[PDB]
Amino acid sequence: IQTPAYILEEDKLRKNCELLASVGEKSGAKVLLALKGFAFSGAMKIVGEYLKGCTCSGLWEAKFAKEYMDKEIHTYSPAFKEDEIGEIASLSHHIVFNSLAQFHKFQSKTQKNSLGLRCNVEFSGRYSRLGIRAKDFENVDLNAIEGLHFHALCEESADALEAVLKVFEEKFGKWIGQMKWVNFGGGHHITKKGYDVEKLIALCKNFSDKYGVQVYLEPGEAVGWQTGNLVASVVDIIENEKQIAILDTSSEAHMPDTIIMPYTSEVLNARILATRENEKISDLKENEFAYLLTGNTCLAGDVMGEYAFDKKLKIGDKIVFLDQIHYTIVKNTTFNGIRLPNLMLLDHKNELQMIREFSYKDYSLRN
Amino acid sequence: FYEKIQTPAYILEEDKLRKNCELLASVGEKSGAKVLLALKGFAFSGAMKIVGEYLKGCTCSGLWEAKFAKEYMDKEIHTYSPAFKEDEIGEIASLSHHIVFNSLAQFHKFQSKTQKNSLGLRCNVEFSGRYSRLGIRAKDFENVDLNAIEGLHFHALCEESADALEAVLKVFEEKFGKWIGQMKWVNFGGGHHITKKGYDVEKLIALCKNFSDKYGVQVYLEPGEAVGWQTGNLVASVVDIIENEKQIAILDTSSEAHMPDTIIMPYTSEVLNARILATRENEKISDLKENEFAYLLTGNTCLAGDVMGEYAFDKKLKIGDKIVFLDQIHYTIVKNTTFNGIRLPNLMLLDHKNELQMIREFSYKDYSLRN
Ligand SMILES: *Cc1c(COP(=O)(O)O)cnc(C)c1O
Ligand SMILES: *Cc1c(COP(=O)(O)O)cnc(C)c1O
Ligand SMILES: NCCCNCCCN
Structure with missing residues (x-):
């Protein structure tokens, strides 16, 4: 991917x-x-x-x-x-x-x-x-x-x-x-x-x-x-009191209903600890590690939530946002010129197929 | 014009x-x-x-x-x-x-x-x-x-x-x-x-x-x-007018797809020659005056919440009338969508000679090639 x-x-x-x-x-x-x-x-x-x-x-x-x-x-x-x-x-x-x-x-x-x-x-x-x-x-x-x-x-x-x-x-x-x-x-x-x-x-x-x-x-x-996921990569990890992962995807552009509704996406092999709106959802357990997951737009509030993982994140790790094929793609944007997520299909033979690969023109010709 | x-x-x-x-x-x-x-x-x-x-x-x-x-x-x-x-x-x-x-x-x-x-x-x-x-x-x-x-x-x-x-x-x-x-x-x-x-x-x-x-x-x-x-507006037409206690005008534009920040922030757009009476979220903003007509202005997506707000006009609206949403060039176009397959607003320029030029006219493929 x-x-x-x-x-x-x-x-x-x-x-x-x-x-x-x-x-x-x-x-x-x-x-x-x-x-x-x-x-x-x-x-x-x-x-x-x-x-x-x-x-x-x-x-x-x-x-x-x-x-x-x-x-x-x-x-x-x-x-x-x-x-x-x-x-x-x-x-x-x-x-x-x-x-x-x-x-x-x-x-x-x-x-x-x-x-x-x-x-x-x-x-x-x-x-x-x-x-x-x-x-x-x-x-x-x-x-x-x-x-x-x-x-x-x-x-x-x-x-x-x-x-x-x-x-x-x-x-x-x-x-x-x-x-x-x-x-x-x-x-x-x-x-x-x-x-x-x-x-x-x-x-x-x-x-x-x-x-x-x-x-x-x-x-x-x-x-x-529950037919598919949005997969992103950790691009950077910084510290500001909490550990924060900056991903190559954006709440606002790529999962807009998370902001509109609002709701918090589940993340594969993670548990939600707190929402972007600071609602407490659960407490960290032993042998867990908390991260803020955040996006790549320039907005202050492009934040998916606070999540507990059972291992430390590294640059280059893939984060899998669960259940992200409905009410996502149909409503997504090129806000801030953020690179759109490609559309792909994992077929019955477990082969990944590129369905749409987007480019600069998807942004430029809409402005 | x-x-x-x-x-x-x-x-x-x-x-x-x-x-x-x-x-x-x-x-x-x-x-x-x-x-x-x-x-x-x-x-x-x-x-x-x-x-x-x-x-x-x-x-x-x-x-x-x-x-x-x-x-x-x-x-x-x-x-x-x-x-x-x-x-x-x-x-x-x-x-x-x-x-x-x-x-x-x-x-x-x-x-x-x-x-x-x-x-x-x-x-x-x-x-x-x-x-x-x-x-x-x-x-x-x-x-x-x-x-x-x-x-x-x-x-x-x-x-x-x-x-x-x-x-x-x-x-x-x-x-x-x-x-x-x-x-x-x-x-x-x-x-x-x-x-x-x-x-x-x-x-x-x-x-x-x-x-x-x-x-x-x-x-x-x-x-x-x-x-x-304040460089420009979004112009839409009244496609239908219906009644459900209030008069409701259904426009050919969508708050969700075409003025997304109105829903996200949320805030209420001003409309040329109208006054805001109430927001989509039912916040009371002002009262109807004596010689005005109140309408809910609403959108063309299939969502229940595609409502711009309730506004007061000096005369009744009619099908075909143009509704001008004020100050809609910044943080709009750059983040708009083809949700529900709604036809995108075209981009136009009213130039220094007061001549209207088409900058971008959208089509079906702007929707289909994004899904
Ligand atoms: C958003 C942004 C701007 C422009 O902000 P405005 O409120 O549109 O003036 C400038 N620089 C950076 C880094 C930004 O994120
Ligand atoms: C949105 C909508 C649907 C589909 O609703 P779902 O929640 O995705 O099943 C069906 N019919 C109409 C008229 C709709 O507006
Ligand atoms: N459209 C929402 C993003 C706004 N970002 C920054 C504020 C712009 N004045």
């Missing part, structure tokens, strides 16, 4: 997609990759051996689905524009509108697509712009709408989906039986250890039998969950 | 940029300090030649910024990194006039590959910070052979005043004083909000001039934000 690099493990992605395929086969639901979280171009054909297509937020994702996967394309945007709707309609099997005005504006340009409406389920979200509330369905012509859609969950359980479906059916139930399909969105933490997979299958099966509809699920995170 | 443009777009105004640069050139003129653009915050490719009319060069964090400085400006190049790497030091050395190291180890490791460059060390001034990895603390200078070192560097400020640089200089001279006289230059870093209304320019000039004279050193300043301050 020339560093930094995001490295997706084929074997792990395959195990995730096997489980998701199993959910679809046992429940009758169709499972789609939500590209927002996980769009790893080197793995799109692999994902497509298992899943039915992509869910896409607009033109660029729809184009990406077409090019990389070429399976079903489902497109939802809070904001379709006039200049893009034609190409989106040419590519998309399903198009979900966020408002009735959007539906009405674009219905005549989407006559070959199966149309849906996003439903605001209003379930603990106040003042959300996403979806249509139930009261606004009264009096509206739904003859041209074949699907209802919701997305209401983030890193959640089968029990949470049950709770959402209960409210979805109480508020929207009069309009469900007349649809061909319903899309339960994403946020289902299906490949996480301990998730109640049998419950999800039963919920999807039971709903489909109850209303005679095709169920769709559109996980993003669950596809990329 | 804005009506025929594809939105969204960041629009830099030449006249405003030139006013800032005139002022920074005035500081250099009067103090003898040499002023550099810190590319971290402002790297607008279409403006680099304009900035070079006024400033002496660029401060760069590494290889990619040094190459950009070389290509776009072709003036002095000053490189500092907390973490130089072996695979890049060669090319950084061929491009840079000054190289500033973050630690003695990094200096000792790369001294022999940097013989044609002027070498500096970054000083941790330790002032109001704890556990900072940036710079060397004064105690670690003691009894170190500094023969090969021609400059000292600090960067200790953010959006600050001439009085705050005065307080930092006092601490810097107190702690590192005994080694300043032997240097050829000192670099006072960035964070000087020189072009903000009210800044005490006169005092900055005196501080720089006195310091220069006292120690017999060439002083360097390396503002980023100051160069870009």
